[PDB]
Design a protein around this ligand. Structure first.
Ligand code: BCB
Ligand code: BCB
Ligand code: BCB
Ligand code: BPB
Ligand code: BPB
Ligand code: MQ7
Ligand code: HEC
Ligand code: HEC
Ligand code: HEC
Ligand code: HEC
Ligand code: NS5
Ligand code: MPG
Ligand code: MPG
Ligand code: FE2
Lengths: 243, 332, 323, 273
């Protein structure tokens, strides 16, 4: 006789093989693929029961978000096929469409574990500093994609929870305002900050903050999205084929 | 540290299986030059006249040869085994019938061993055969022998370092490693598998499922047997200057038929031959050798694959003297 | 390009943060210090570290195992320090070479190996309690502890459960650099080629898949770092453009996508399954399958090839062949 | 057929070549020039696999195998039945993989995100090239490449290893393996961490960035950080192949002995020998 042998030419490892595949396909199709549908459904143009999170600082949220309001999209169809691309009908940067699009995040300031504003300028975060060895960009010029100085750095905005800089704030030459820029759109040199995502003139229409010394989650999205839009829209050539 | 290309590669399996030899040309060339030192056959001589069983006093193995044939064998043996010292390595210079020097008695046994290899072990040596030179390579002590503990250097013509010497305990693991192609396998496959016929090289089941009665607790062979078999294979691979795929399709090491090469069956016969040489011809010579030739347990030096092969898949690249020296076998 | 995805151009320094746990706050040890160069590609802060009873026990038990292993390795070179350093990778502490079954083997042939294994097991269990309990003390789920549990179980399968199921401590894994590696081949050989074990294949598919998934997810988040995609917890509770773009990149490429929460489930599951698959393969090996290649031939799955050199009969079967 | 938030992102632009011509979707799939070229190579490749497979011994998915030529064909064309199908399928595969990569660049550009994914995908494509193109070129025959069969390719891997006696002693393999394992572990830890914060259990509050860093500082005395774990995971995963490739390319072209013997550089130093 043989260990593992069952009636027929069946054996134990053989039965375990079927079981293993059944488990894997069950987990993938009946669990993971359902978890994958907690955002973006129902589809437009098999679903799990809604998920509720108890938030760190009071209140709850249930996902996916349903918003009491709806944004208008300044986009025109290019042709009539189901899957034709859409085209901006105005200034895509200001209208926030395509890669200039932002999400309708909460109009609330992201908090630290202790309930303070998380992302704040160093003028507020007076206990924070720049590590010795790195450039202090305050007072340096910002040079845009066209090689023209757009303004001058006034402050750095720090994440107080992760100890990490996330934005620079600059005065916008000729516009009596300041603007934020995510550090991911900044090439930090000793004598200047280089920004190739947008042209000098385009800094005047960067989304404005409601308050000078704090920023909401939605505002962070609007700010970041504007510069990403520039990658495709700063000039007409940027939408056309590279080659 | 590295070996510059090109590499010489051969194919020993169906296309797409990555089976074959992988060789460095400069290494092959150097071994070919060394092996080419094999002295050529002596001139043929007179086949007629009385047998030396009649002519000489103490001829017990080669008695049917004529005098010219017998002295030709003696000349050949001398060049192959003791060229620097000549006839008197084995003979009392004033009495050639005398057996007083230990090499004489050893050489008689060696004549019998050589004839036995070429007569009884054709499944291994085929019609290529061996002579004294195959092992001795011009010196009384063959360059590649084994004791009942691992020894370094592998080639005994090289001077050992202090740590290589067998009495230096700290060097043991390196002595073992250098016999198993630098692996850490904690087994001496010479003493386990080649000194005698006590162990089974095969360790892999020939059924899909475990057989009831051989598969639980002390019914079972310890897993150590599988490491020891891997050590033997590492040692054989290095001894022949080759890799596993010369003999096996690694898909199934335990399968014959299409899954093994003809060379694997030859290797199997080689294991059997070496065991016979060692048990029946070489180990018993401890009684005839001086103390200075013996290992620490009183053992005579013995043979492994490298003794003949010396890093080549065929000893001396297949050079032969079989037809030149019919007195070394095969004997009818 | 987003140079921030390469390194931190301008590092920030602030007062160190301490999040209070339900117990153990007074058992954190170390003055933190900062490394400028590390702060280019990670947090610059090093320390403090939590002590606690389970961590201290882990260290004690683990150190004991390590001393047993090292002492035995030193004995292997007759306690010569230069040869220890030279030969280190070749040195080991071995399971029993003789078959004693499930008998506690002689110290000199497997006993010290079993003792080191016991102290290693106590160390891993102690560390598990630390990993589990730190999550609880901080009000976190225990997802890390359960992943770690599968990895530990796999170590237990190759260290002691397989040995117990077949009834021989000789089958355990040695301690040592080359020696534990040497075991992989001995075990594969003994059991008929691990390439033919389905569970070995499953484990590899999941291990390769972790490679694929961490590359893809790592890269995805770097690609959306400009939108704060790295702030994954608030992207979960309040979806932003970072993870909308991340999902659409994948949806447009492969035709389906995950969410920022669910990608972490995929990765956790794949990682877990490397270990779960490997464990099941090991548990079946020797117990219910003796030769994986032949089990596959039995079930008609193994590839076959034409002879290249002529088919070679087993000479052991020839009439009058020696044993 | 669109996610609820998807419409605002479906704009023209970002292509590398072709312009508007192929800038559209089929269901959820972006097309583009490299969508067309990828389908073309996939269709050709899979069609050759079907035709080749039908000339062989078996239709069992485990056992089917499309093999390269004998070594004796060198780098030349081989007959279709004796290695030529393999050669044609290799070209199609490379075409498909590269097309796939460049399509990902287009998708990245349209979404205004970085190109990190297609760059990362260059790593496995490179490793395929090492195994199937570079190493065979250095050895001078396509026949050193791996066959296309679910189980047969494992027979190749197996024999390749053992041609160098014990492949586990290959230093580039040792690095490759260490990265595979640390990567798997790190994905577990990372996935686990994120889930532990968002899913504390019961009616408990979701936790914070600060809690993530506290957890690893407590357990190991260091937390790498939330952006940095993503760069690290990409580094670890990539280095599976980036270091492995050296071990693969060395075996045959730069080393003909067994791998354990390579360590004689260390072991055989005269002053401790
Ligand atoms: C140098 C080492 C190699 C290696 C060693 C190897 C080992 C040791 C093992 C495998 C295994 C596997 N390998 Mg192989 N491998 C494979 C594909 C495969 C799968 C059959 C399987 C699971 C892999 C997986 O889940 O990965 C992660 C990716 C995931 C999870 C995404 C899904 C991928 C999907 C399963 C791929 C399916 C490919 C199909 C054969 C279809 C082929 C294309 C068709 C449409 C023409 C491909 C497609 C390639 C290419 C293109 O290079 C490749 C190269 C290699 N593998 C090298 C030759 N691989 C395992 C197996 O079970 O084999 C039977 C296994 O044990
Ligand atoms: C010739 C030999 C082979 C072999 C033999 C083999 C064996 C015997 C086993 C595997 C197994 C496995 N193999 Mg395979 N293998 C693999 C891949 C793999 C792994 C995915 C898988 C699981 C092991 C693992 O993740 O361990 C790494 C993870 C570990 C060890 C977890 C450790 C966790 C622990 C909690 C950490 C503790 C650390 C502490 C600090 C320690 C402190 C100690 C002190 C106190 C003393 C690939 C990709 C290939 C290729 C490409 O050829 C391959 C070929 C081979 N394998 C050859 C066929 N392999 C395993 C498996 O699946 O079997 C079914 C397995 O048992
Ligand atoms: C007996 C032989 C052995 C061996 C022989 C071996 C060889 C010969 C090689 C490795 C290599 C490697 N081995 Mg090793 N091995 C490994 C691990 C590994 C890997 C980390 C590494 C790289 C694998 C690779 O190249 O994938 C390649 C995967 C590729 C190229 C995937 C390409 C994907 C493509 C771009 C996209 C494919 C798409 C599909 C066709 C799409 C299908 C459509 C569907 C999905 C819709 C482990 C963990 C073990 C264990 C546990 O023992 C082990 C044992 C062994 N290996 C034995 C000792 N191994 C390689 C290495 O780096 O060595 C230094 C290597 O060459
Ligand atoms: C797919 C799933 C994977 C996976 C998963 C997970 N892996 C985890 C977790 C998860 C989820 C944890 O939560 C836990 C941890 O905390 O993470 C930070 C952990 C760990 N994985 C480690 C090592 C590791 N994982 C490997 C593999 C995989 N992991 C597989 C791939 C491998 C391989 C591949 O060989 C290795 C080597 C340690 C770092 C750590 C345990 C420490 C321990 O248990 O220490 C216990 C022992 C001690 C504390 C003793 C220390 C002794 C010191 C040095 C004293 C000096 C001696 C002195 C000189 C004496 C004389
Ligand atoms: C260290 C870096 C890692 C890494 C990284 C990344 N991995 C990526 C990305 C990144 C970043 C993506 O962006 C991309 C993707 O979209 O993800 C969802 C992707 C992908 N990785 C896949 C498979 C995969 N990744 C593996 C390994 C790693 N990935 C390593 C670990 C392995 C192993 C290990 O075996 C496999 C099998 C596909 C699922 C997908 C390409 C699909 C494709 O190219 O479509 C285009 C081509 C096809 C759809 C089919 C082509 C059919 C040809 C013509 C005919 C078959 C020929 C073939 C040679 C026959 C082989 C048969 C035989 C061996 C049985
Ligand atoms: C119909 C037709 C012919 C159309 C022509 C147009 C065209 C070119 C069509 C393409 C058709 C083809 C070839 C389809 C095949 C598509 C392929 C290759 C599918 C492979 C799927 C596989 C095996 C993936 C392996 C990885 C895997 C396990 C993924 C599952 C989890 C997912 C979806 C991860 C992706 C993912 C990651 C990695 C994030 O980090 C992330 C972060 C935040 C939000 C979302 C995400 C997210 O979705
Ligand atoms: C050891 C390797 C030897 C060397 C070197 C030489 N000879 Fe030898 N001799 C040897 C043996 C084992 C025997 C007996 C062979 C047998 O079949 O039993 C012999 C015998 C002789 C004899 C016969 C003497 C007699 O019995 O009367 C002679 C004349 C002889 N050998 C000559 C000889 C010469 C000339 C040598 C050098 C060229 C020589 N031998 C070398 C062993 C060995
Ligand atoms: C390998 C299979 C051998 C062949 C073929 C021949 N001999 Fe040998 N010899 C061999 C070994 C392993 C040993 C023991 C080691 C030792 O050197 O003692 C020997 C020994 C001898 C000796 C004694 C040498 C000495 O100790 O001084 C002699 C004289 C001798 N062998 C002679 C000899 C002859 C004449 C052979 C052909 C007929 C021959 N040997 C073949 C290994 C092998
Ligand atoms: C021919 C010259 C070989 C080379 C090179 C290698 N191996 Fe081998 N192998 C060979 C033979 C003649 C035998 C059978 C011996 C006997 O006395 O029966 C073996 C056996 C094995 C086994 C055991 C098979 C079984 O049935 O249990 C294994 C696992 C094995 N060999 C592996 C192996 C490896 C890993 C090799 C390279 C390192 C290798 N072999 C080389 C012949 C030859
Ligand atoms: C001398 C006495 C030998 C010893 C000891 C071993 N081998 Fe040998 N081998 C010897 C000869 C004279 C020949 C040539 C036979 C021929 O057909 O030409 C061989 C041949 C082999 C081969 C075949 C190589 C090939 O055909 O290409 C193999 C695989 C081989 N030998 C293996 C082998 C092994 C594994 C040995 C130790 C166990 C071994 N040989 C010892 C002579 C001698
Ligand atoms: C000093 C510095 C800081 C650290 C030193 C690190 C160091 C040098 C360590 C020692 C040398 C090294 C690196 C050794 C490496 C060994 C390796 C890689 C070993 C790997 C694996 C070993 C394994 C899986 C062994 C498992 C064994 C077990 C699970 C045994 C289990 C036994 C039990 C559960 C006991 C129950 C049975 C009862 C009857 C006693
Ligand atoms: C995945 C394993 C990670 C290992 C990383 C270990 C980092 C070592 C840090 C130790 C911190 C100890 C406290 C330092 C402050 C002492 C003053
Ligand atoms: C290959 C992966 C190797 C592993 C290393 C990982 C560390 C992260 C480096 C990221 C570089 C990406 C530039 C980002 O590129 C871009 O997005 C551009 O727009 C290119 O101009
Ligand atoms: Fe993440």
């Amino acid at each position: 006789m043989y260990h593992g042998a069952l009636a027929q030419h069946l054996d134990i490892a053989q039965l375990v093989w079927y079981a293993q595949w059944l488990v894997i396909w069950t987990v993938v199709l009946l669990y993971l693929r359902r978890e994958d549908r907690r955002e973006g459904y129902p589809l437009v143009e098999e679903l799990p029961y809604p998920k509720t999170f108890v938030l760190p600082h009071g209140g709850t949220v249930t996902v996916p978000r349903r918003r009491p309001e709806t944004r208008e999209l300044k986009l025109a169809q290019t042709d009539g096929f189901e899957g034709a691309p859409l085209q901006p009908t105005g200034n895509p940067l200001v209208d926030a469409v395509g890669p200039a699009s932002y999400a309708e995040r909460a109009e609330v300031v992201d908090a630290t574990v202790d309930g303070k504003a998380k992302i704040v300028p160093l003028r507020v975060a007076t206990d924070f500093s720049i590590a010795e060895g790195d450039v202090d960009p305050r007072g340096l010029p910002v040079v845009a994609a066209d090689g023209v100085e757009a303004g001058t750095v006034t402050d750095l905005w720090v994440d107080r929870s992760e100890h990490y800089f996330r934005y620079l704030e600059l005065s916008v030459a000729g516009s009596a305002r300041t603007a934020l820029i995510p550090l991911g759109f900044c090439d930090v040199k000793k004598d200047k900050i280089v920004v190739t995502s947008i042209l000098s003139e385009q800094f005047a229409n960067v989304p404005r903050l409601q308050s000078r010394d704090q920023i909401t989650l939605r505002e962070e999205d609007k700010v970041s999205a504007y510069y990403a839009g520039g990658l495709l829209y700063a000039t007409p050539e940027r939408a056309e084929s590279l080659l | 540290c590295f070996e510059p290309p090109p590499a010489t590669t051969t194919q020993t399996g169906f296309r797409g299986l990555s089976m074959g030899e992988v060789l460095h040309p400069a290494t092959v060339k150097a071994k070919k030059e060394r092996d080419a030192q094999y002295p050529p056959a002596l001139a043929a001589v007179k086949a007629e006249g009385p047998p030396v069983s009649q002519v000489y006093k103490n001829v017990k193995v080669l008695g049917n040869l004529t005098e010219a044939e017998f002295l030709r064998t003696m000349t050949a043996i001398t060049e192959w085994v003791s060229p620097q010292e000549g006839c008197t390595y084995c003979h009392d210079e004033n009495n050639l019938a005398s057996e007083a020097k230990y090499p004489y008695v050893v050489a008689r046994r060696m004549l019998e061993m050589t004839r036995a290899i070429n007569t009884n072990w054709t499944q291994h040596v085929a019609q290529t055969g061996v002579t004294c030179y195959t092992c001795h390579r011009g010196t009384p002590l063959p360059p590649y022998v084994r004791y009942l503990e691992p020894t370094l250097p592998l080639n005994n013509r090289e001077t050992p370092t202090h740590v290589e010497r067998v009495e230096t305990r700290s060097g043991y693991v390196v002595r073992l490693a250098k016999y198993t192609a630098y692996s850490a396998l904690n087994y001496d496959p010479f003493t386990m598998f080649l000194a005698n016929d006590k162990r089974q090289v095969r360790v892999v089941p020939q059924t899909a499922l475990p057989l009831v009665g051989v598969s639980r607790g002390k019914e079972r062979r310890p897993l150590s047997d599988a490491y020891a078999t891997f050590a033997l294979m590492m040692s054989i691979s290095d001894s022949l200057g080759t890799n596993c795929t010369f003999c096996h399709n690694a898909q199934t090491f335990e399968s014959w038929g299409k899954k093994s090469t003809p060379q694997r069956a030859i290797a199997w016969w080689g294991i059997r031959m070496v065991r016979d040489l060692n048990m029946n011809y070489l180990a018993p010579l401890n009684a005839s050798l001086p103390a200075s030739r013996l290992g620490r347990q009183g053992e005579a030096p013995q043979a492994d694959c490298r003794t003949c092969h010396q890093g080549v898949t065929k000893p001396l690249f297949g050079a032969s003297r079989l037809k030149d020296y019919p007195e070394l076998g095969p004997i009818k | 390009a987003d140079y921030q995805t390469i390194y931190t151009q301008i590092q920030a320094r602030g007062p160190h943060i301490t999040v209070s746990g339900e117990w153990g706050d007074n058992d954190r040890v170390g003055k933190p210090f900062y490394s400028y160069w590390l702060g280019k590609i990670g947090d610059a802060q090093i320390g403090p570290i939590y002590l606690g009873a389970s961590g201290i026990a882990a260290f004690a038990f683990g150190s004991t195992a390590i001393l047993i292993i090292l002492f035995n390795m030193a004995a292997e070179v007759h306690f010569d320090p230069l040869q220890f350093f030279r030969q280190f990778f070749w040195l080991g502490l071995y399971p029993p070479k003789a078959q004693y079954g499930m008998g506690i083997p002689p110290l000199h042939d497997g006993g010290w190996w079993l003792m080191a294994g016991l102290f290693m097991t106590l160390s891993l269990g102690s560390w598990w309690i630390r990993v589990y309990s730190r999550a609880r003390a901080l009000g976190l789920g225990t997802h890390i502890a359960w992943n770690f549990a599968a990895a530990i179980f796999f170590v237990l399968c190759i260290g002691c459960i397989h040995p117990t199921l077949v009834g021989s401590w000789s089958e355990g894994v040695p301690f040592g650099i080359w020696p534990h590696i040497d075991w992989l081949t001995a075990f594969s050989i003994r059991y008929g080629n691990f390439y033919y074990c389905p569970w070995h294949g499953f484990s590899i598919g999941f291990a390769y898949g972790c490679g694929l998934l961490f590359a893809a997810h790592g890269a995805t988040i770097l690609a959306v770092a400009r939108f704060g995609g790295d702030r994954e917890i608030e992207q979960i509770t309040d979806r932003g453009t970072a993870v909308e773009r991340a999902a659409l990149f994948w949806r447009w490429t492969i035709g389906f996508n995950a969410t920022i929460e669910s990608v972490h489930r995929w990765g956790w599951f794949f990682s877990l399954m490397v270990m779960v698959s490997a464990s099941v393969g090991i548990l079946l090996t020797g117990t219910f399958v003796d030769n994986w290649y032949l089990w596959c031939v039995k079930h008609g799955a193994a590839p076959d090839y034409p002879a290249y050199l002529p088919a070679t009969p087993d000479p052991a079967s020839l009439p009058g062949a020696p044993k | 057929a669109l996610l609820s938030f998807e419409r605002k992102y479906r704009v023209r632009g970002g292509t590398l070549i072709g312009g508007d011509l192929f800038d559209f979707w089929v269901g959820p799939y972006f097309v583009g020039f490299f969508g067309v070229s990828a389908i073309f190579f996939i269709f050709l490749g899979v069609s050759l696999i079907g035709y080749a497979a039908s000339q062989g011994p078996t239709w069992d998915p485990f056992a089917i195998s499309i093999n390269p030529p004998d070594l004796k064909y060198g780098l030349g064309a081989a007959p279709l039945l004796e290695g030529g199908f393999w050669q044609a399928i290799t070209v199609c595969a490379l075409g498909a993989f590269i097309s796939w990569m460049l399509r990902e660049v287009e998708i990245s550009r349209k979404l205004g995100i970085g190109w990190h994914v297609p760059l990362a995908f260059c790593v496995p494509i490179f490793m395929f090239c090492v195994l199937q193109v570079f190493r065979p070129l250095l050895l001078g025959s396509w026949g050193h490449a791996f066959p296309y069969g679910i189980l047969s390719h494992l027979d190749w891997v197996n024999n390749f290893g053992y041609q160098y006696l014990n492949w586990h002693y290959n230093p580039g393999h040792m690095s490759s393996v260490s990265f595979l394992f640390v990567n798997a572990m790190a994905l577990g830890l990372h996935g686990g961490l994120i889930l532990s914060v968002a899913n504390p259990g019961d009616g408990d509050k979701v936790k914070t960035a600060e809690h993530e860093n506290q957890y690893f500082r407590d357990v190991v005395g260091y937390s790498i950080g939330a952006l940095s774990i993503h760069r690290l995971g990409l580094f670890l995963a990539s280095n599976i192949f980036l270091t492995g490739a050296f071990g693969t390319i060395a075996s045959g072209p730069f080393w003909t002995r067994g791998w354990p013997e390579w360590w004689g550089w260390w072991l055989d130093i005269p002053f401790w020998s």
